[PDB]
Design an enzyme around this catalytic site. Sequence first.
Site, PDB file in Angstrom:
ATOM      1  CG  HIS A 174      76.370 -71.225  89.443  1.00 50.71           C
ATOM      2  ND1 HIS A 174      75.024 -71.519  89.461  1.00 50.71           N
ATOM      3  CD2 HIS A 174      76.511 -70.154  88.625  1.00 50.71           C
ATOM      4  CE1 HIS A 174      74.375 -70.651  88.706  1.00 50.71           C
ATOM      5  NE2 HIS A 174      75.254 -69.813  88.186  1.00 50.71           N
TER       6      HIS A 174
ATOM      7  CD  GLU B 280      71.741 -50.459  90.807  1.00 49.92           C
ATOM      8  OE1 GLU B 280      71.023 -49.490  90.480  1.00 49.92           O
ATOM      9  OE2 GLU B 280      72.950 -50.338  91.128  1.00 49.92           O
TER      10      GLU B 280
ATOM     11  CG  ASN C  85      71.154 -47.283  84.673  1.00 53.36           C
ATOM     12  OD1 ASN C  85      72.346 -47.590  84.712  1.00 53.36           O
ATOM     13  ND2 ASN C  85      70.600 -46.716  83.609  1.00 53.36           N
TER      14      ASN C  85
ATOM     15  CD  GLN D 165      71.547 -42.135  85.649  1.00 54.03           C
ATOM     16  OE1 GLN D 165      70.424 -42.433  85.232  1.00 54.03           O
ATOM     17  NE2 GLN D 165      72.295 -41.188  85.086  1.00 54.03           N
TER      18      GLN D 165
ATOM     19  CD  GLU E 135      70.598 -46.472  93.235  1.00 48.22           C
ATOM     20  OE1 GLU E 135      70.303 -45.624  94.102  1.00 48.22           O
ATOM     21  OE2 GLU E 135      70.701 -46.195  92.024  1.00 48.22           O
TER      22      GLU E 135
ATOM     23  CG  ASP F 209      73.202 -73.542  91.438  1.00 54.53           C
ATOM     24  OD1 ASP F 209      74.030 -73.021  92.218  1.00 54.53           O
ATOM     25  OD2 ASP F 209      73.144 -73.246  90.225  1.00 54.53           O
TER      26      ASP F 209
ATOM     27  N   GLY G  91      74.488 -63.730  83.629  1.00 50.79           N
ATOM     28  CA  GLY G  91      74.308 -62.606  84.532  1.00 50.79           C
ATOM     29  C   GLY G  91      73.012 -62.688  85.313  1.00 50.79           C
TER      30      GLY G  91
ATOM     31  CB  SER H 203      73.373 -67.271  87.771  1.00 51.30           C
ATOM     32  OG  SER H 203      73.440 -68.398  86.914  1.00 51.30           O
ATOM     33  N   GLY H 204      71.177 -66.878  90.084  1.00 45.95           N
ATOM     34  CA  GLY H 204      71.034 -66.527  91.489  1.00 45.95           C
ATOM     35  C   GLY H 204      69.792 -65.701  91.749  1.00 45.95           C
TER      36      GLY H 204
END
Lengths: 240, 54
Positions: free
Chosen positions: A45, A59, A61, A64, A69, A93, A186, A188-189
Amino acid sequence: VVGGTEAQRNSWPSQISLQYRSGSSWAHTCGGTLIRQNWVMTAAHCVDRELTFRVVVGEHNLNQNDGTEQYVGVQKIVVHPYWNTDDVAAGYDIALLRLAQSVTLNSYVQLGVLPRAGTILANNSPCYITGWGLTRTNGQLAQTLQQAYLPTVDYAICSSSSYWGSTVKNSMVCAGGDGVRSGCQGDSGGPLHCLVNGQYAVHGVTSFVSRLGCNVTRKPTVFTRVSAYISWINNVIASN
Amino acid sequence: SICSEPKKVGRCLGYFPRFYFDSETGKCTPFIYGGCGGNGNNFETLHQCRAICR
Protein backbone atom coordinates in the site's frame (compact mmCIF):
# COMPACT_ATOMS: atom_id res chain seq x y z
CA VAL A 1 5.12 4.84 16.84
CA VAL A 2 2.79 5.71 19.72
CA GLY A 3 4.02 5.12 23.26
CA GLY A 4 7.62 4.56 22.23
CA THR A 5 11.00 6.18 22.80
CA GLU A 6 13.82 7.42 20.60
CA ALA A 7 15.97 4.53 19.40
CA GLN A 8 19.72 4.64 20.03
CA ARG A 9 20.99 6.04 16.73
CA ASN A 10 21.64 3.37 14.06
CA SER A 11 20.67 0.57 16.49
CA TRP A 12 18.30 -0.83 13.86
CA PRO A 13 20.57 -0.66 10.78
CA SER A 14 18.17 -2.44 8.39
CA GLN A 15 15.47 0.23 8.93
CA ILE A 16 14.92 2.48 5.90
CA SER A 17 12.86 5.64 5.26
CA LEU A 18 10.78 5.54 2.08
CA GLN A 19 10.23 8.99 0.61
CA TYR A 20 8.30 10.38 -2.37
CA ARG A 21 9.36 13.25 -4.61
CA SER A 22 8.06 16.67 -3.63
CA GLY A 23 9.18 19.67 -5.69
CA SER A 24 12.91 19.14 -5.94
CA SER A 25 12.93 17.60 -2.44
CA TRP A 26 11.67 14.44 -0.71
CA ALA A 27 9.07 13.56 1.95
CA HIS A 28 8.85 10.51 4.22
CA THR A 29 5.77 8.31 3.76
CA CYS A 30 6.64 4.77 4.93
CA GLY A 31 9.28 2.53 6.45
CA GLY A 32 11.05 -0.44 4.87
CA THR A 33 13.66 -3.12 5.57
CA LEU A 34 16.93 -3.39 3.61
CA ILE A 35 17.09 -7.07 2.54
CA ARG A 36 19.86 -7.00 -0.10
CA GLN A 37 22.45 -4.34 -0.98
CA ASN A 38 20.00 -3.26 -3.71
CA TRP A 39 16.56 -4.44 -2.49
CA VAL A 40 14.10 -3.09 0.07
CA MET A 41 11.04 -4.90 1.48
CA THR A 42 8.05 -2.67 2.24
CA ALA A 43 4.23 -2.63 2.26
CA ALA A 44 2.29 -2.86 -1.03
CA HIS A 45 0.00 0.00 0.00
CA CYS A 46 3.05 2.28 0.30
CA VAL A 47 4.09 2.01 -3.35
CA ASP A 48 1.09 0.84 -5.40
CA ARG A 49 0.83 4.32 -6.91
CA GLU A 50 2.51 6.45 -9.58
CA LEU A 51 5.03 8.33 -7.43
CA THR A 52 8.80 8.73 -7.74
CA PHE A 53 10.44 7.24 -4.64
CA ARG A 54 13.83 7.17 -2.95
CA VAL A 55 15.14 5.14 -0.03
CA VAL A 56 17.31 6.45 2.82
CA VAL A 57 19.50 3.96 4.69
CA GLY A 58 21.52 4.81 7.80
CA GLU A 59 18.87 7.34 8.79
CA HIS A 60 18.03 8.61 12.29
CA ASN A 61 16.93 12.27 12.19
CA LEU A 62 14.80 13.05 9.12
CA ASN A 63 15.71 16.75 8.92
CA GLN A 64 19.45 16.70 9.66
CA ASN A 65 22.33 15.04 7.81
CA ASP A 66 24.51 13.36 10.47
CA GLY A 67 26.85 11.39 8.19
CA THR A 68 25.62 7.79 8.18
CA GLU A 69 22.91 8.31 5.56
CA GLN A 70 22.90 7.15 1.96
CA TYR A 71 20.18 8.37 -0.40
CA VAL A 72 19.31 6.08 -3.33
CA GLY A 73 16.57 6.17 -5.97
CA VAL A 74 14.07 3.38 -6.53
CA GLN A 75 14.65 1.54 -9.84
CA LYS A 76 11.85 -1.01 -9.86
CA ILE A 77 8.74 -1.61 -7.78
CA VAL A 78 7.31 -5.15 -7.52
CA VAL A 79 3.97 -5.14 -5.72
CA HIS A 80 2.61 -8.56 -4.73
CA PRO A 81 0.18 -9.40 -7.59
CA TYR A 82 -2.59 -10.49 -5.18
CA TRP A 83 -2.50 -7.25 -3.21
CA ASN A 84 -5.91 -5.54 -3.16
CA THR A 85 -6.00 -1.85 -2.09
CA ASP A 86 -9.73 -2.07 -1.30
CA ASP A 87 -9.10 -4.93 1.12
CA VAL A 88 -5.98 -4.73 3.25
CA ALA A 89 -7.38 -7.43 5.52
CA ALA A 90 -7.21 -9.87 2.61
CA GLY A 91 -3.44 -9.73 3.11
CA TYR A 92 -0.58 -9.78 0.59
CA ASP A 93 0.52 -6.34 1.81
CA ILE A 94 4.11 -6.64 0.62
CA ALA A 95 6.27 -5.10 -2.10
CA LEU A 96 9.92 -5.26 -3.12
CA LEU A 97 11.89 -2.27 -4.33
CA ARG A 98 15.07 -2.64 -6.37
CA LEU A 99 17.36 0.35 -5.84
CA ALA A 100 18.90 2.38 -8.70
CA GLN A 101 22.27 1.89 -7.03
CA SER A 102 23.44 -0.47 -4.32
CA VAL A 103 24.02 0.91 -0.84
CA THR A 104 27.33 0.39 0.95
CA LEU A 105 27.03 -1.97 3.90
CA ASN A 106 28.67 -0.87 7.15
CA SER A 107 28.02 -0.68 10.90
CA TYR A 108 25.14 1.72 10.17
CA VAL A 109 23.69 -0.07 7.13
CA GLN A 110 23.01 -3.81 7.46
CA LEU A 111 20.72 -6.40 5.93
CA GLY A 112 17.65 -7.34 7.92
CA VAL A 113 17.72 -10.99 8.94
CA LEU A 114 14.58 -12.81 7.74
CA PRO A 115 12.88 -15.79 9.46
CA ARG A 116 12.90 -19.31 8.02
CA ALA A 117 9.90 -20.06 5.78
CA GLY A 118 6.78 -20.89 7.76
CA THR A 119 8.00 -19.64 11.16
CA ILE A 120 5.16 -18.85 13.56
CA LEU A 121 5.95 -17.02 16.81
CA ALA A 122 4.72 -18.27 20.16
CA ASN A 123 2.15 -16.01 21.80
CA ASN A 124 3.66 -13.04 23.63
CA SER A 125 7.01 -13.27 21.80
CA PRO A 126 9.23 -10.24 22.48
CA CYS A 127 9.31 -7.88 19.49
CA TYR A 128 9.97 -4.20 18.69
CA ILE A 129 8.32 -1.94 16.11
CA THR A 130 10.33 0.99 14.72
CA GLY A 131 9.60 3.98 12.52
CA TRP A 132 9.21 7.71 12.00
CA GLY A 133 5.41 7.53 12.18
CA LEU A 134 3.13 9.66 14.34
CA THR A 135 3.70 9.46 18.10
CA ARG A 136 0.33 11.02 18.94
CA THR A 137 -3.10 11.46 17.34
CA ASN A 138 -3.08 14.41 14.95
CA GLY A 139 0.69 14.77 15.30
CA GLN A 140 3.50 15.24 12.79
CA LEU A 141 5.92 12.52 11.70
CA ALA A 142 8.60 11.87 14.36
CA GLN A 143 11.91 13.66 13.79
CA THR A 144 13.98 10.79 15.14
CA LEU A 145 13.49 7.02 14.78
CA GLN A 146 11.27 5.62 17.51
CA GLN A 147 10.92 2.14 18.97
CA ALA A 148 8.31 0.38 21.10
CA TYR A 149 8.13 -3.03 22.74
CA LEU A 150 5.26 -4.81 20.95
CA PRO A 151 4.80 -8.46 22.00
CA THR A 152 2.96 -10.82 19.66
CA VAL A 153 -0.64 -11.92 20.03
CA ASP A 154 -1.05 -15.38 18.51
CA TYR A 155 -3.55 -16.20 15.76
CA ALA A 156 -5.93 -17.87 18.22
CA ILE A 157 -6.18 -14.83 20.51
CA CYS A 158 -5.96 -12.20 17.77
CA SER A 159 -8.75 -13.90 15.80
CA SER A 160 -11.13 -13.83 18.79
CA SER A 161 -14.15 -11.51 18.69
CA SER A 162 -12.77 -9.01 21.24
CA TYR A 163 -9.60 -8.64 19.22
CA TRP A 164 -9.68 -8.77 15.40
CA GLY A 165 -12.11 -11.63 14.70
CA SER A 166 -12.06 -12.72 11.04
CA THR A 167 -10.16 -9.63 9.92
CA VAL A 168 -6.81 -11.22 10.74
CA LYS A 169 -5.37 -14.01 8.57
CA ASN A 170 -2.76 -16.67 9.32
CA SER A 171 -0.50 -14.77 6.89
CA MET A 172 -0.29 -11.88 9.38
CA VAL A 173 1.36 -11.16 12.72
CA CYS A 174 -0.51 -9.28 15.45
CA ALA A 175 1.50 -7.39 18.03
CA GLY A 176 0.71 -5.00 20.86
CA GLY A 177 -2.92 -4.08 21.47
CA ASP A 178 -2.29 -2.99 25.06
CA GLY A 179 -3.69 0.49 24.48
CA VAL A 180 -0.33 2.10 25.23
CA ARG A 181 1.97 1.26 22.31
CA SER A 182 1.34 0.81 18.59
CA GLY A 183 2.35 1.70 15.06
CA CYS A 184 0.79 4.87 13.64
CA GLN A 185 0.70 6.84 10.35
CA GLY A 186 4.15 6.79 8.71
CA ASP A 187 5.17 3.45 10.21
CA SER A 188 3.76 1.25 7.39
CA GLY A 189 6.20 -0.94 5.47
CA GLY A 190 8.66 -0.97 8.34
CA PRO A 191 9.90 -3.96 10.35
CA LEU A 192 8.64 -5.77 13.38
CA HIS A 193 11.95 -6.96 14.89
CA CYS A 194 11.85 -10.15 16.95
CA LEU A 195 14.71 -11.70 18.96
CA VAL A 196 14.65 -15.34 17.92
CA ASN A 197 17.57 -17.78 18.25
CA GLY A 198 20.00 -15.03 19.26
CA GLN A 199 19.45 -12.48 16.48
CA TYR A 200 16.76 -9.90 15.79
CA ALA A 201 14.84 -11.12 12.75
CA VAL A 202 12.28 -9.09 10.82
CA HIS A 203 9.09 -11.14 11.24
CA GLY A 204 6.68 -8.37 10.29
CA VAL A 205 5.99 -5.70 7.69
CA THR A 206 3.82 -2.99 9.23
CA SER A 207 0.43 -3.02 7.49
CA PHE A 208 -2.64 -1.79 9.39
CA VAL A 209 -4.52 -0.85 12.55
CA SER A 210 -8.18 -0.45 13.48
CA ARG A 211 -10.05 2.51 12.01
CA LEU A 212 -10.87 3.30 15.65
CA GLY A 213 -7.31 4.60 16.02
CA CYS A 214 -3.63 3.62 16.02
CA ASN A 215 -3.38 2.81 19.72
CA VAL A 216 -6.48 0.85 20.83
CA THR A 217 -6.76 -1.88 23.47
CA ARG A 218 -7.42 -5.30 21.90
CA LYS A 219 -6.73 -3.94 18.42
CA PRO A 220 -3.07 -4.93 18.01
CA THR A 221 -1.03 -3.47 15.17
CA VAL A 222 -1.16 -5.92 12.25
CA PHE A 223 1.85 -6.89 10.14
CA THR A 224 2.37 -8.96 7.02
CA ARG A 225 4.03 -12.22 8.15
CA VAL A 226 7.41 -12.23 6.37
CA SER A 227 7.91 -15.98 6.86
CA ALA A 228 4.91 -16.68 4.62
CA TYR A 229 6.67 -14.92 1.72
CA ILE A 230 10.27 -16.22 1.75
CA SER A 231 9.97 -18.17 -1.51
CA TRP A 232 8.20 -15.27 -3.20
CA ILE A 233 10.87 -12.81 -1.99
CA ASN A 234 13.77 -15.02 -3.14
CA ASN A 235 12.24 -15.70 -6.55
CA VAL A 236 11.51 -12.02 -7.28
CA ILE A 237 15.10 -11.06 -6.45
CA ALA A 238 16.57 -13.96 -8.47
CA SER A 239 14.46 -12.94 -11.48
CA ASN A 240 14.27 -9.15 -11.36
CA SER B 1 -21.30 12.61 -5.60
CA ILE B 2 -17.89 12.26 -3.94
CA CYS B 3 -17.63 15.63 -2.16
CA SER B 4 -20.52 14.48 0.03
CA GLU B 5 -18.62 11.32 0.95
CA PRO B 6 -17.09 11.12 4.43
CA LYS B 7 -13.44 11.79 5.17
CA LYS B 8 -11.86 8.36 5.38
CA VAL B 9 -8.36 7.68 6.77
CA GLY B 10 -8.64 3.90 6.42
CA ARG B 11 -6.82 1.11 8.25
CA CYS B 12 -3.35 1.43 6.71
CA LEU B 13 -0.41 3.12 8.47
CA GLY B 14 1.09 5.08 5.58
CA TYR B 15 1.56 8.84 5.75
CA PHE B 16 -0.15 10.39 2.74
CA PRO B 17 -1.08 14.08 3.03
CA ARG B 18 -4.38 14.55 1.16
CA PHE B 19 -7.36 16.91 1.09
CA TYR B 20 -11.08 16.45 1.72
CA PHE B 21 -14.16 18.67 1.48
CA ASP B 22 -15.44 19.31 5.03
CA SER B 23 -19.17 19.34 5.72
CA GLU B 24 -19.51 20.81 9.21
CA THR B 25 -16.97 23.46 8.11
CA GLY B 26 -17.47 24.00 4.36
CA LYS B 27 -13.95 24.03 2.86
CA CYS B 28 -11.34 21.69 1.34
CA THR B 29 -9.13 20.66 4.27
CA PRO B 30 -5.88 18.73 4.84
CA PHE B 31 -5.81 15.27 6.40
CA ILE B 32 -3.49 12.28 6.63
CA TYR B 33 -4.66 9.34 4.51
CA GLY B 34 -3.32 5.90 5.50
CA GLY B 35 -2.73 4.67 1.94
CA CYS B 36 -5.45 2.06 1.35
CA GLY B 37 -9.22 1.75 1.14
CA GLY B 38 -9.69 5.43 0.38
CA ASN B 39 -13.02 6.77 -0.89
CA GLY B 40 -13.94 9.58 -3.28
CA ASN B 41 -13.53 12.57 -0.95
CA ASN B 42 -9.76 12.26 -1.12
CA PHE B 43 -7.71 14.44 -3.46
CA GLU B 44 -3.95 14.32 -4.09
CA THR B 45 -3.97 18.10 -4.58
CA LEU B 46 -5.79 21.07 -3.09
CA HIS B 47 -6.47 22.27 -6.64
CA GLN B 48 -8.11 18.94 -7.49
CA CYS B 49 -10.42 19.30 -4.47
CA ARG B 50 -11.58 22.83 -5.38
CA ALA B 51 -12.13 22.13 -9.07
CA ILE B 52 -13.73 18.82 -8.13
CA CYS B 53 -16.27 20.26 -5.65
CA ARG B 54 -16.16 23.98 -4.86
